[PDB]
Amino acid sequence: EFNILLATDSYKVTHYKQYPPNTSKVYSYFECREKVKYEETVFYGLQYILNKYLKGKVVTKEKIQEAKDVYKEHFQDDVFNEKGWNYILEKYDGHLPIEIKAVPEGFVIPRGNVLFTVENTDPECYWLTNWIETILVQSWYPITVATNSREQKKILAKYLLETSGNLDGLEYKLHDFGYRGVSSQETAGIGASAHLVNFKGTDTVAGLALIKKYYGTKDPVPGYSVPAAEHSTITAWGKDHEKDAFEHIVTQFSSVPVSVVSDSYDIYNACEKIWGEDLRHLIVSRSTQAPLIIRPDSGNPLDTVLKVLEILGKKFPVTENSKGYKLLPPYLRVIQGDGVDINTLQEIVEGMKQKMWSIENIAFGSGGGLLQKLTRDLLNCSFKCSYVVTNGLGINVFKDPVADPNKRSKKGRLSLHRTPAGNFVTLEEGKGDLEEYGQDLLHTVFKNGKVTKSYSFDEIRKNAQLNIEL
Template identity: 30%
Template sequence: MRMSASSPPTICRASTTNGSLSSKERIMILNINPLSQADFYKTGHIFQYPEGTTEVYSNFTPRSDRLAPVLRDRFDSKVVWFGLQGFIKMFLIEIWNENFFKQPKDVAIGRYKRRLDCALGPGAVDVSHIEALHDLGYLPIEIKSLPEGSRVDIRVPTMTIRNTSDARFFWVTNYLETVISDELWKPSTVATIAYEYRRLLEDFAERTGAPKAFVDWQGHDFSARGMSGFMDSMSAGAGHLLSFYGTDTIAAIDYLEDRYNANAEREIVGGSVPATEHSVMCLGGKESEIGTFRRLITEIYPSGVVSIVSDTWDFWKVITEYARELRPQILARTPNAIGLAKVVFRPDSGDPVRIIGGYNCVEIDRMSDLSSAIEQGAEAIQVNGKYFILDGAGEEPLLREAREAEVKGAVECLWDIFSGTETDKGYRVLNERVGLIYGDSITLQRAEAILNALERKGFASCNVVFGIGSYTYQYITRDSFGWAIKATSGVVNGERIAVQKDPVTDGGAKKSACGLLRIEQEGNRFVLYDNQTEEQERQGELRTVFVDGKLVVDEDLATIRARLGAVV
């Protein structure tokens, strides 16, 4: 969360290399059995395929955006494809190798057999095919993928998977369905939503004359504590970092160094600033809260950026009385090594649109003029030095007396104290020594409403940073973009068979492609061609990234970011 639009990157000069644990140490600590990362029904499918089956060919596709939490008038029905390389390195290579192929055969097979015997009954599933896989020593599959960071049209597959030349292992393709789905739908979904935030912020930056470089830091990942465990927060947090630099998810940077060849010593992977929490403010005491602010601003962090949570008791008092009293100390802050010197106030409760942007207030002489004010679009009124918020509308609107600060909103309150500059499009920008970040229950819809409110009041979009938390990144499911793996082709007794799912009881969203697949890029779209020949399937934009236990395409974060074209 750099609060300066033109700040150069902060480069870490640590002497250590990527990661603190070796891959083997990390995986052995987790001790994940890769064969257990499947639904129970997968264990019997090998026996259910037609006799003579030698190949299963499947794809992973975002099938629908009907439930996607996007801004409909802005969304162009494309998802950001991301997470496959990290999954391949972590699961298909490290976990499978360390916790299955490198384990003694009796240990690896015994562990799997015990799980099935205990759950399904002794001897319910023959494990000879698992023994054969262990003897083989690697995963005999080929994965082809569109390049990560690509924006892929809905209903276009992002990857395909099939078993390779050893026909005994046709069953492996869809045995991996569960783990591919549960590990890959979320990084792509988060990367897509982060990109939608990015597009929204870039639009308002253009409209109000805010510097585009500020957008790199304007979306800040606050989601880690609300995610489904640390592995979830790592991979999802990495998806956020395709479109922004700002993050409080430390492990997302580790993930990108470990899985995507990023290096925080050479590039900006992600960054943050010192910030307080409510325990800090509470323990400082309510009566001496301003003293806590003064100590933080002048003693603990006299230079650079410090973000201070400000709603522990009375946010409006902080943003008016405290801010005014501490104005000399705030303006006197010294820049750090990269030129930053800012106090960021962080409200953390209430209606984010109103807290930041306030209300459209119309001044009237008497209450009898209320209807006229409503006709002018008033959301609040000022009459005889008092402020009232309109909590209802109609013939008898409800009026709630409010403080001036609440009606104005945080940005305008800070402007009254610190003033600032104007963009070349005439929108106001707060003094560079102060800022705001809001990270409670932010969604794309609320972010847009906040930016609209600021624009109506004549403020540029760069006056606020958004903390994008689990209210965005955990309020999603696999169905947000309808992610699913489906088989579309197979070989039985030497004959290639085209496969298609098309339930008569469904409206068409679950209808799958058919046969072998080819994806072509046509203009700014990826287009699916199904029912392809073997020769046609080898063409197009799908490229082999993993085959027979080995990663064959190993890209870096910079390449993927450049492909997406988000952060500069």
């Protein structure tokens, strides 16, 4: 079972001996520091961490002894604070004496604002606030996935609106293909759930169970998929039988959308000759609700999309929509699922617009770009101590390195408020107590071992909506 005493950076085991004597409070905060610009971030994922790792009885006699034995060997010395952990076990039945206040999940907040704060509720546990930094800072990942996915939704919305005049289908425009490309099963669920804040199409099944267990949705599931081929199900037929594979697959899934990877040997031949001529009669008979979705999967992503569209536009009837953009028939669509990240997504939709193709014709799949090619440094996610009480006196604490002004941290007790113009401001040095800015938007979400406020996944999705959708 998970042991929170073994879930921190090793150096944090020694910090209880390093804080100033007579310190009764350590208060810390998380922000996406100010430095695609990523001007605003979606706050998402803390509730998972609170429930899975922090709530309830998280200390036991056995976990304390386990940690003591490991740290004796790992440091080659006795430095582990057995007394302080045993105090939590005896005093609070192993429940953490910590209070966490957070902006509501799904909220979209400009960079450089407090998103959550952490402090100890018992003076003996001044060391506990930053013990749990390592666990809590991992919220950078769902925040960053949700934010990067939302920024891709903004690009798709802009170009869909310009080329088609509406946003129909926007939710299914970016599909999660990243289960194989992430570092672990646990990451797959967390990252897939973060993408589902913005979209409804996913093949990363792990995200469904996470949302069900930790957030919840009114609908039975938060994300959906369609039948689709992979190279094994095409190439297993033999190279001379690609047409037989395509025919078998489309026939098998005649009444539902079906995606068919078309680049096993020659994507351009497959489009022009196999789909275009040999099997055309099985495509033009398809329903609007069950289109054939052609999937290239190699080559330069923009050049390949444009050439596939040109081929299909010569072999199938093409209409011009009311915005002047070309539109394939409703039984035929394309999905580009190779090489897609926020930068290439932008390149593809702009190149399509230039060649007068509607964004209605295309959807995207993204794997490593969506869930793996992201780091804590993208949004400068950081956790720092801003306030301590020593000898009964509160002092404002901060770092301000000489070589990097971007690393300067906030001072004192913090609160988050709406400005007069409707923007956001973080008040420092306890100035929120003056009440000149209205109510603090941070709410207590965890106190003394209990999750005190929770959000459904439906609420999170509403909070994370685009302005354009609004």
